[PDB]
Amino acid sequence: FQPFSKKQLKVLTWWRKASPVSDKDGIICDGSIRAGKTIVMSFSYVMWAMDTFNEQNFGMAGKTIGALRRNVITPLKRMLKSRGYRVKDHRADNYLTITFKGKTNYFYLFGGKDESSQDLIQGITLAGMFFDEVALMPESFVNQATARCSVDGAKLWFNCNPAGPYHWFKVEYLDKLDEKNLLHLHFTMDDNLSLSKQVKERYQRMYKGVFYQRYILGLWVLAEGIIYDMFDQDEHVVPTVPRPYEKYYVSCDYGTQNPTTFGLWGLYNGVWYKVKEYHYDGRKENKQKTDQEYYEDLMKFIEDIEKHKFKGVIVDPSAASFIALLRQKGIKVIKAKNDVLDGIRNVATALNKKMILYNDCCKETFREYSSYVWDEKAAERGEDKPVKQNDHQLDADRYFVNTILFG
Ligand SMILES: [Cl-]
Ligand SMILES: [Cl-]
């Protein structure tokens, strides 16, 4: 059947006249991943909007519009259409026209990426606003978007996973629930009735440490100390011996004034192996290399592998000139998105499931693993980010894991 839990049904009904909490100005759902909160939240938003207004404008925001469409709008579309709603997607325009029982409203899509994101939601007048991944958004974009919700009866809807305790959304919204007159429902995987006791426990084994506390337990816990505290040389390091690899990639972090790194990654029996590393530090050497010199080193680095098994070079986005040279030379290139927090989370998960393993010649990588830490002072201000020192192999690994194994 795939039935809804008690907590999911509250998301669907809170706003109705029969509900005790219908006068609340909005809702916040936070907590764990895979909790079946995102799709009910979005469905309930459209349902509430279509039932309460006609010919109004409504907002929907993600970290980017692309992500919003992937995470919410596409599954929301399919689900809306199956229960008698109709949808038109004005692609470039970035809004939807939704129709139900002779009523029509307009749903505008936004991205809340940076301090300029606030400038794109100044004109429009709104009867509601929905934020997916609000803990990934700037406070300024959310202050504006909420200020554009001027129509009488307007409600605010927030969906997120936890960040740190000092994060603005925890401090200004979740700790001020009665002040803002919002409802709050906290989800864990127990609220998702379609997951067995086995599958829930499998998801539990994908996370340890801070990311386990946030994405499984749903706790707003501070990031502190070693980032990859699940990395373990008893489990993640293997001998440097030949294996019959079926597929290869190279991942690259670029530096002229910082080190440049290559990692050769090789697939064997379901696991991607870091076969070796290249580590050129121009500062230590007292000699900087050019794009051409690094191209030459990269050709040496991949000499002894069959060209039909090499699937390309994953490159740090800022190395645009280097990418042009590689394409000019016939080398396939994939630009890494460089989504930092999601990449770090995904590297951690790759280690926990042993999706990756390292040859013991990757000695520079291992030195970075032992030193790569969270920015302590930033975390205590609400900003989760690494201290960007001795992370040149680790950034390349992240590009590889995040581009090929996730995404
Ligand atoms: Cl969800
Ligand atoms: Cl979030």
Residue numbers in the entry: 11 to 417
Paper text:
Most dsDNA bacteriophages and viruses utilize a powerful DNA translocation motor to package their unit-length genome into a preformed procapsid. A central component of the motor, large terminase, consists of an N-terminal adenosine triphosphatase (ATPase) domain comprising ASCE (Additional Strand Catalytic glutamate) and lid subdomains, and a C-terminal nuclease domain, connected by a short linker sequence. While both domains are involved in interaction with DNA DNA translocation is powered by the ASCE subdomain using energy released coinciding with ATP hydrolysis. The nuclease domain is responsible for cleavage of the genomic DNA concatemer at both the initiation and completion stages of viral DNA packaging.
Subsequent soaking of these crystals in cryo-protectant containing a high concentration of NaCl resulted in a transition from R32 to C2 crystal form (Crystal form 2) with each of the ATPase domains of the three subunits related by the crystallographic 3-fold axis adopting a unique stable position. In the resulting C2 crystal form, there are three molecules in the asymmetric unit, each having a slightly different domain orientation, with an overall inter-subunit Cα rmsd of 0.8–1.6 Å. In this structure, the N-terminal ATPase and the C-terminal nuclease domains, tethered by a linker, adopt vastly different relative orientations to those observed in large terminases from other bacteriophages. In common with other phages, the N-terminal ATPase domain of the D6E terminase comprises both an ASCE and lid subdomains facing each other. From the lid subdomain, the polypeptide chain leads, through an ordered linker comprising 12 amino acids (230–241), into the C-terminal nuclease domain. The nuclease domain resembles the RNase H-like fold which, as found for the large terminases of other viruses, differs from other RNase H family proteins by an extended β-sheet and the presence of an auxiliary β-hairpin. Interestingly, the β-hairpin, previously predicted to interact with DNA, has an extended hairpin-like loop structure with an α-helix at its tip. The relative position of the ATPase and nuclease domains is stabilized by a salt bridge formed between R224 of the lid subdomain and D394 of the hairpin-like loop, and an interdomain hydrogen bond (M216-N362). There are also additional ATPase-nuclease domain–domain interactions resulting in a total surface area buried between the two domains of 362 Å2. For comparison, areas buried in inter-domain interactions in T4 and Sf6, are significantly smaller, 212 and 78 Å2, respectively. It is possible the distinct domain arrangement of the D6E large terminase stabilized by these interactions represents a biologically important conformationally locked inactive ‘initiation’ state that serves to prevent futile hydrolysis of ATP before assembly of this extremophilic motor.
